[PDB]
DNA sequence: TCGGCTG
RNA sequence: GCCGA
DNA sequence: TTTTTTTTTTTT
């Protein structure tokens, strides 16, 4: 791809702006490519601007080589065209080409060094380095890349980090003042959040409430459900968005005119996003399945999610571990790590749910030690809320959601807070 | 599997390929071709490593250049999807029905057709002078003089063959060779081997058959009573009483007569695993095989023993008669001798 | 028309955005076209964009291939060119070609399946599906059109959701008003429901009673018995549906005339379904076994069930689990998850049974924490019932049900209703 | 196979009356087979009877056939024989041939349909089916089975089920009036039963006695013993059968003459079964073994068992469980499940013994909770008899047998019974 | 420079 | 590919 | 088929 690299060096500007610092005449060849790049470098050195084709011809005329290679050079510069390629692929391919040629040059260099070492010192060369330098120069070829930043320097990058503080660029509002207060800005992008609760306590109720709240805040919400069917999740959402109890739905107590009117009233709002509910077989979805789902949702429709709600991570499968090869701890930890990797790759808040141990299903207080499946789930999670329901709490339609883990704020400031739950409407309300 | 349909579809899907050749021997169906996966070599156009073997219970395409061995169905899927679907459908189509391929079971063979009467450009060894270069060479070979009436010397071997089988060589370049006529049981020559002279002949050291059905066993006409010893070299057989030698790369037990009393006397190499393969396939048939496991000499063939280690024919015969083992007894010596 | 499809994949943004997500490597051919599409798919996966011809023929084609394949790919790419063609005919012809190639692949696959199955075992190339699933695969090739149907969009599909609401086309009502008034219409189609009683407290009287109830409602019932023979389950069904004591069937107080007359009277009714009872050895049937049985019943008896009642979930086996585990939790939970996957695949209410803990025996109440087989079964269950008749209800021929878990409604509304068991007839009646 | 099918259609009455309803003219060929079957169909239609070979020859004589077809049909007719093959293999093989040819016909039909579809619609065959019916056609291919018996179909097998009821085709008597009274006819085939030995009861003795009583009724019995030698178990059998005290056998009071006389007297009775004692090392016998032992006994000794008494359940081995322990709940549960599966698949009654807890030991009344292997064994054991010996019963030479679990009948009907145990004679007698 | 060669 | 000429 | 770490679960 030397032709492409030279053509985009001559014509493109941003590509030259980024790729020129990591360029050496040794990278290309010993023939037409080397002489062409030498002409380019000489012209940019003399006059600090990328030359033109006419400039190349003038340089060839005034500065000449032997005719046998002169003809090759002149016929090499007859095919460099504009060819407006994309920038990401061009940069990546130039990086791969320079890395491959650097490896080849380093290998040939170490071979020449060893060959010189084999020779007697009487007739050996002096310019070639010594054998003890063979390792380090290989490193010099190993770490060649266009990534101008190896990592984040604390003092060199005091700027470009203060921007992330003025504009939050990570926080996503919760639409529930208590959650924002205990989170200081809401769940952050590229993070995995977990609602942990016992059987039939309201894990999916809470996930649907959060999904609806995000939907009201103009957010793309992808509700990937493994346990419930698409229609069931949609109904649990409609119970929240349309302010009609589930009993009012299953008893036909809402006229179709009312349903259509409320749906179109929500649609007319410009502050309404999109909610996609996807169903997968229980235990038949992994990280790569979610990645394929995201790809198809991006392609088949102009739908890129900003929130991903997985119904239950425990009933997913690990994308690396073969199914049921490892015990609960290893498998569930791998699943959590894969989900968090998906979250950080998509820069999307990945809510999900988890079950608690059999001992906590009738416990007025739920501790982190009661997490079912792996104990590495709290380790890999970024914000964990335990949903607790008791007879006394049920008597007033309230729960005891409590902060089990928090990477967003001091979990002890507001550890336990009552959260009213309208199960008929499947909605979360804050006590005020 | 369905080998006949495999062969048909392989022929259909490989005929158009360059350097195709339908090598069909009386028991083997093979196809030679430049492998499309690798292309073999520009120099090695005729040395095409693409081969197809359909003589097995399944048809396999193997190329030693790219080391690509696969069933015919896989090749059809990867290269001829239309023909792949055709084959995969018709195999099921005829799968339900009974195989009818045995119905047209006919033999296109023929009896002795090119019976060799006289040999132009050939002078028999016993007819030659004692100072002839071939005579000195066979003196170095230490062949007994009495058997020299079984070997000829020639200088026009391509001319001789083209007089017998015209068109074998586009050029009749004069070539001295040791013509060994291979006769039948009744004593008439059915083929002849142009044994190379000096260290090695220029090219094409091959036994020319008068016809494809001609015998490949030398000395059958001279077989007398007693056990028959089967060797690998006709010259070696000349040192063996009741010793016949198979001439060819294929070793068929059925064509070799004296099933009751045939004794296989092979080389003295425990290495060369092809030899071990031959020994194993002979012993699995429960045949009489001689074993060199106790041989005082360490040469390769009997003539090599005589020339280099000074072995005498009587020692060879007494070793052979005392070292014939069969069945488990043979298998024991085979197992210990191989390595 | 592969050349046209690729030429408009590379040189047309709208065509790509319309047709790419349905495109696949198994659609074009076994020649240069497949390799060209492989390169295109690799580039799209790497850079989320359609490459240009320069990217393909230089940056991409220069990879692992064969001389023949390289020449063919280069010839095809040089043969690619943009041609002005209307973007309604292009999409339609592309859809037709994709459907045709899907049908071709499906036919080839089913022919290969037939060939493989005709081959005897020990060479039968496992992981290849049996002959029984020949039609659906072809049916899969039928619905392969370019219809962007991924998930259930909340706003774009309110009409279909309302149709499902008004038809109530998920509920399969019980014959008992009491269960219908707590399940808001009965059990739902793609759901796994569980009964827990203990030892000789029920757990098959209830399952047989529900089978009889679903039979009297015209539903197809498949009673897959694991702990009972094919005849004892049918005997309990006879006792329920003939109003005859189960002992009376044993001693011989019922003549053949009475039995035959009652059976024919039941047959003459038009509201009677088919209660097919099939037995498998205890511990020797998995979800794959049940899928094969369903396929066989569909093929032979033209019997597609709407209710599947497995006599015992705990003495089943897992299809995914390969090495039997001494750990009850994971084994039972995997079995339950596979059963629920089967239920949601066949849209059949799947009733089954679970064993309660030893502590719950002879206890006036049973909580959800009394499940013995696994705490993961209530996690993937949809509706659980408990039988808690200790001594007093036995003397009064009663059975109290606590409704430990309910995904169909608030489980606290009608927590207790004292089901009217009749053990001699093996049935349930209300106490209205 | 066509020749055999036609020959056994011509020269049989049972095979014809079984396989004719599933034979179609398209099943055979387009040549001699099709024409011959056409002649058979024509003859059976014009005259409602299977044609004879000369009748078929006459039909060939008077029919529209071409010269080659005439010769082929004549030869095939002359090639029809009256070979008396067995019935089951003939049915199975003709069913397999019919299914294979039906699959071939359906595949050819769908292939021709797809070929017809890819034609200009103006030039197409109207009679050909549409593409959308392809999944149906293959279904009709798989809806071909000579005997459609999959599970017990209610309302379609009421006569067979009633015949099983009247014939008591599942029960096997006990030779004791009390046991038949508490089991409504005795133990049932394809079932597992367990004796819960208490504080020193002798698990072997009861299994020993039942083994005997089952022997005196003419049933084939196989006592797989673990904790005892074949000679010891056979000595207990001799004690129960010959009325000779066990210790008397050791002392030598009974002489060889009397022993042989009693043995030959028992041999004279035609109502005596066969008992096969087989020993296995403690813990070296799982259920799968027993299957191989049954195979060997059937193949070699022609001994087809109806009773299989295994000496001790706890001493047994799980079929597929690596970890082994002397008394563990998971192991006993797995062993019970595997043994019951063996009983079901063999259509044989299986008996075993098990131990209970100390609470059951001290108390005369034994509850299912007061069981060492409760929940596990109770779950997979059709019959469970708690055998308890008390000091007062020891003085009275009796034992208190309690029906802990009876899948056969009601638990409380006749729960506790005093049994006349004779330890020296190893015998059980009834109590007046 | 040719043919024949297992996996 | 290895062997034979 | 043992064997060891770890976790999770469950029974007594
Ligand atoms: N369809 C429904 N109609 C009415 N109330 C419901 C419905 N589904 C759930 N509920 C109520 O909401 C509570 C929690 O519901 P879910 O969140 O769906 O259960 P869950 O937390 O997902 O527990 P799992 O995942 O099934 S173990 C239940 O206990 C019921 O009181
Ligand atoms: N033939 C019968 N006559 C009368 N009552 C019966 C009969 N068979 C069973 N029962 C009653 O049914 C109950 C026995 O439980 P079942 O309904 O058979 O299921 P189950 O035995 O509890 O399941 P498991 O796994 O075997 S504990 C007891 O209440 C018995 O009284
Ligand atoms: Mg849930
Ligand atoms: Mg039961
Ligand atoms: Zn090749």
Coordinates of C-alpha atoms in Angstrom, one line a residue, chain D residues 67-358:
Chain D
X67 CA -43.2 -54.9 -24.5
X68 CA -40.3 -54.0 -22.1
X69 CA -42.7 -53.3 -19.3
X70 CA -44.5 -56.6 -20.1
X71 CA -41.3 -58.5 -19.9
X72 CA -40.2 -56.8 -16.7
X73 CA -43.5 -57.3 -14.9
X74 CA -43.6 -61.0 -16.0
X75 CA -40.1 -61.5 -14.7
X76 CA -40.8 -59.8 -11.4
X77 CA -44.0 -61.8 -11.0
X78 CA -42.1 -65.0 -11.6
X79 CA -39.5 -63.7 -9.0
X80 CA -42.1 -63.6 -6.2
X81 CA -41.7 -66.2 -3.5
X82 CA -43.6 -67.4 -0.4
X83 CA -40.6 -67.1 2.0
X84 CA -41.8 -67.4 5.6
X85 CA -39.8 -64.5 7.2
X86 CA -40.4 -63.3 10.7
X87 CA -43.0 -60.7 11.3
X88 CA -41.4 -57.9 13.4
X89 CA -38.4 -57.5 11.2
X90 CA -40.5 -57.6 8.0
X91 CA -42.7 -54.8 9.4
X92 CA -39.8 -52.7 10.5
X93 CA -37.9 -53.1 7.2
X94 CA -40.9 -52.3 5.0
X95 CA -41.6 -49.3 7.2
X96 CA -38.0 -48.1 6.8
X97 CA -38.1 -48.6 3.0
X98 CA -41.4 -46.7 2.8
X99 CA -40.1 -43.8 4.9
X100 CA -36.9 -43.6 2.9
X101 CA -38.8 -43.6 -0.4
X102 CA -41.3 -41.0 0.9
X103 CA -38.4 -38.8 2.0
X104 CA -36.9 -39.1 -1.5
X105 CA -40.2 -38.3 -3.1
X106 CA -40.8 -35.2 -0.9
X107 CA -37.3 -34.0 -1.6
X108 CA -37.7 -34.4 -5.3
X109 CA -41.0 -32.6 -5.1
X110 CA -39.7 -29.6 -3.2
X111 CA -36.6 -29.4 -5.5
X112 CA -38.9 -29.4 -8.6
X113 CA -41.1 -26.8 -6.9
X114 CA -38.0 -24.5 -6.4
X115 CA -36.9 -25.1 -9.9
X116 CA -40.4 -24.2 -11.1
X117 CA -40.4 -21.0 -9.0
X118 CA -37.2 -19.7 -10.7
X119 CA -39.0 -19.4 -14.0
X120 CA -40.8 -16.5 -15.8
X121 CA -44.2 -16.3 -14.1
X122 CA -45.8 -16.0 -17.6
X123 CA -44.3 -19.4 -18.4
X124 CA -44.9 -21.6 -15.3
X125 CA -47.0 -24.6 -14.3
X126 CA -50.1 -23.6 -12.5
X127 CA -50.6 -27.1 -11.0
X128 CA -47.3 -27.0 -9.2
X129 CA -47.6 -26.0 -5.5
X130 CA -46.4 -22.6 -4.3
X131 CA -43.2 -22.2 -2.4
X132 CA -44.9 -21.3 0.9
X133 CA -46.2 -24.9 1.1
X134 CA -42.7 -26.5 1.2
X135 CA -42.6 -26.9 5.0
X136 CA -46.0 -28.7 4.8
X137 CA -44.9 -31.2 2.2
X138 CA -41.8 -32.3 4.1
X139 CA -44.2 -32.7 7.1
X140 CA -46.3 -35.1 5.0
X141 CA -43.0 -36.9 4.3
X142 CA -42.4 -37.4 8.0
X143 CA -46.1 -38.2 8.8
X144 CA -45.5 -41.8 7.6
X145 CA -45.3 -44.5 10.3
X146 CA -46.8 -48.0 10.0
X147 CA -47.6 -48.2 13.7
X148 CA -48.5 -44.9 15.3
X149 CA -48.0 -45.6 19.0
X150 CA -46.4 -42.7 20.8
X151 CA -47.4 -42.6 24.5
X152 CA -50.8 -43.6 26.0
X153 CA -53.5 -41.6 24.2
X154 CA -56.5 -40.9 26.4
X155 CA -60.0 -41.4 24.8
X156 CA -58.3 -43.4 22.1
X157 CA -57.1 -46.3 24.2
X158 CA -59.8 -46.6 26.8
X159 CA -60.4 -50.3 25.9
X160 CA -56.8 -51.2 26.2
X161 CA -56.5 -49.3 29.5
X162 CA -59.6 -51.1 30.8
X163 CA -58.2 -54.4 29.8
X164 CA -55.1 -53.6 31.7
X165 CA -57.3 -52.7 34.7
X166 CA -59.3 -55.9 34.7
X167 CA -56.3 -58.1 33.9
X168 CA -54.2 -56.6 36.6
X169 CA -51.4 -56.6 34.1
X170 CA -49.1 -54.6 36.3
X171 CA -49.5 -56.2 39.7
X172 CA -47.4 -59.1 41.0
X173 CA -48.7 -60.8 44.2
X174 CA -46.7 -61.2 47.4
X175 CA -47.9 -64.6 48.6
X176 CA -48.8 -62.7 51.8
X177 CA -52.4 -61.6 52.2
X178 CA -51.4 -58.5 54.2
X179 CA -49.1 -57.1 51.5
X180 CA -51.6 -57.6 48.8
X181 CA -54.2 -55.9 51.1
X182 CA -52.0 -52.9 51.5
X183 CA -51.0 -52.7 47.8
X184 CA -54.3 -53.4 46.0
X185 CA -52.9 -56.5 44.3
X186 CA -49.2 -56.4 45.2
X187 CA -46.1 -54.6 43.8
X188 CA -46.3 -53.3 40.2
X189 CA -43.9 -53.9 37.3
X190 CA -41.4 -51.3 36.3
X191 CA -41.2 -50.0 39.9
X192 CA -38.7 -49.7 42.7
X193 CA -39.4 -50.7 46.3
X194 CA -37.3 -50.2 49.5
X195 CA -37.3 -51.7 53.0
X196 CA -36.2 -49.2 55.7
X197 CA -34.4 -51.3 58.3
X198 CA -34.4 -49.7 61.7
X199 CA -32.1 -50.4 64.7
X200 CA -30.7 -53.7 63.7
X201 CA -33.4 -55.2 61.4
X202 CA -31.3 -57.1 58.9
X203 CA -31.8 -55.5 55.5
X204 CA -30.8 -58.8 53.9
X205 CA -33.5 -60.8 55.7
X206 CA -36.6 -59.1 54.3
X207 CA -35.2 -58.9 50.8
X208 CA -34.2 -62.6 51.4
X209 CA -37.8 -63.5 52.3
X210 CA -39.5 -61.6 49.6
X211 CA -36.9 -63.1 47.2
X212 CA -38.2 -66.5 48.4
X213 CA -41.9 -65.8 48.4
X214 CA -41.4 -64.4 44.9
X215 CA -39.6 -67.7 44.1
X216 CA -42.4 -69.9 45.3
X217 CA -44.8 -68.0 43.0
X218 CA -42.9 -69.1 39.9
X219 CA -41.3 -65.7 39.2
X220 CA -37.8 -65.4 37.8
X221 CA -35.8 -63.6 40.6
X222 CA -32.1 -62.2 40.6
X223 CA -30.7 -61.3 44.0
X224 CA -27.7 -59.0 43.2
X225 CA -25.9 -59.1 46.6
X226 CA -23.1 -56.8 47.8
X227 CA -22.4 -57.3 51.5
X228 CA -22.7 -61.1 51.3
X229 CA -21.3 -64.0 49.4
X230 CA -23.4 -65.9 46.9
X231 CA -23.2 -69.0 49.2
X232 CA -24.5 -67.0 52.2
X233 CA -27.5 -65.5 50.3
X234 CA -28.3 -68.9 48.8
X235 CA -28.1 -70.4 52.3
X236 CA -30.7 -67.9 53.5
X237 CA -32.8 -68.8 50.5
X238 CA -32.4 -72.5 51.5
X239 CA -33.4 -71.7 55.0
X240 CA -36.6 -70.0 53.8
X241 CA -37.4 -72.6 51.2
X242 CA -36.5 -75.9 52.9
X243 CA -37.8 -75.0 56.4
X244 CA -34.3 -75.7 57.6
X245 CA -33.0 -73.4 60.3
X246 CA -29.9 -71.4 59.2
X247 CA -27.8 -72.4 62.2
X248 CA -28.8 -76.0 61.6
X249 CA -27.1 -75.7 58.2
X250 CA -23.9 -74.6 59.8
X251 CA -24.1 -77.2 62.6
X252 CA -24.9 -80.1 60.3
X253 CA -28.1 -81.3 61.9
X254 CA -29.7 -81.6 58.5
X255 CA -27.9 -84.3 56.5
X256 CA -27.2 -84.5 52.8
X257 CA -29.9 -87.1 52.3
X258 CA -32.7 -84.9 53.7
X259 CA -31.3 -81.8 52.0
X260 CA -31.3 -83.4 48.6
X261 CA -34.7 -84.9 49.2
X262 CA -36.2 -81.5 50.0
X263 CA -34.4 -80.0 47.0
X264 CA -35.8 -82.6 44.6
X265 CA -39.2 -82.4 46.1
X266 CA -39.2 -78.6 45.4
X267 CA -37.9 -79.4 41.9
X268 CA -40.9 -81.7 41.4
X269 CA -43.3 -78.8 41.9
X270 CA -44.1 -77.0 38.6
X271 CA -45.0 -73.8 40.5
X272 CA -41.4 -73.0 41.4
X273 CA -39.4 -70.2 39.8
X274 CA -35.7 -69.8 39.3
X275 CA -33.4 -67.8 41.6
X276 CA -30.1 -66.5 40.3
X277 CA -27.7 -65.1 42.9
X278 CA -25.0 -62.8 41.7
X279 CA -22.4 -61.1 43.9
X280 CA -20.7 -57.8 43.4
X281 CA -18.0 -56.0 45.4
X282 CA -19.3 -53.5 47.9
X283 CA -19.6 -50.2 46.0
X284 CA -18.3 -51.8 42.8
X285 CA -21.8 -52.2 41.3
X286 CA -23.8 -49.2 39.9
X287 CA -27.1 -49.5 38.0
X288 CA -25.4 -49.6 34.6
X289 CA -23.6 -52.8 35.6
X290 CA -26.9 -54.5 36.5
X291 CA -28.0 -53.8 32.9
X292 CA -25.0 -55.7 31.6
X293 CA -25.7 -58.5 34.0
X294 CA -29.3 -58.7 32.8
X295 CA -28.0 -58.8 29.2
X296 CA -25.7 -61.6 30.1
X297 CA -28.3 -63.6 31.9
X298 CA -30.8 -63.2 29.1
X299 CA -28.3 -64.1 26.4
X300 CA -26.5 -67.0 28.1
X301 CA -28.9 -68.5 30.8
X302 CA -32.1 -67.5 28.9
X303 CA -33.1 -66.2 32.4
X304 CA -35.5 -63.3 31.9
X305 CA -36.2 -61.8 35.3
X306 CA -39.4 -60.3 36.7
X307 CA -38.0 -59.7 40.2
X308 CA -34.6 -58.0 40.9
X309 CA -33.6 -57.8 44.5
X310 CA -30.5 -55.8 45.2
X311 CA -29.1 -56.4 48.7
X312 CA -28.5 -52.8 49.8
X313 CA -29.1 -49.4 48.3
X314 CA -26.6 -47.5 50.3
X315 CA -23.9 -50.1 49.5
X316 CA -24.6 -49.6 45.8
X317 CA -22.9 -47.2 43.5
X318 CA -24.2 -44.3 41.5
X319 CA -24.2 -44.9 37.8
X320 CA -22.4 -41.7 36.9
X321 CA -21.0 -40.0 40.1
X322 CA -17.2 -39.8 40.7
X323 CA -17.4 -39.0 44.5
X324 CA -18.4 -42.0 46.6
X325 CA -19.3 -42.0 50.3
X326 CA -20.6 -44.6 52.7
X327 CA -23.8 -42.5 53.6
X328 CA -24.4 -39.4 51.5
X329 CA -27.8 -37.9 50.5
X330 CA -26.8 -37.1 46.9
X331 CA -25.5 -40.6 46.3
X332 CA -28.6 -42.4 47.7
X333 CA -30.8 -40.1 45.6
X334 CA -28.9 -40.8 42.4
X335 CA -28.9 -44.5 43.2
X336 CA -32.6 -44.6 43.8
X337 CA -33.3 -42.7 40.6
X338 CA -31.0 -45.0 38.5
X339 CA -32.4 -48.2 40.0
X340 CA -36.0 -47.0 39.3
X341 CA -35.0 -46.1 35.7
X342 CA -33.6 -49.6 35.4
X343 CA -36.8 -51.1 36.7
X344 CA -38.9 -49.0 34.3
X345 CA -36.8 -49.9 31.3
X346 CA -36.7 -53.6 32.2
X347 CA -40.4 -53.9 33.0
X348 CA -39.4 -55.6 36.2
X349 CA -40.1 -55.1 39.9
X350 CA -37.0 -54.0 41.8
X351 CA -36.4 -54.3 45.6
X352 CA -33.7 -52.9 47.8
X353 CA -33.0 -51.9 51.4
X354 CA -32.0 -48.7 53.2
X355 CA -31.2 -47.4 56.7
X356 CA -33.0 -44.8 58.8
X357 CA -32.0 -42.4 61.4
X358 CA -31.6 -42.9 65.2

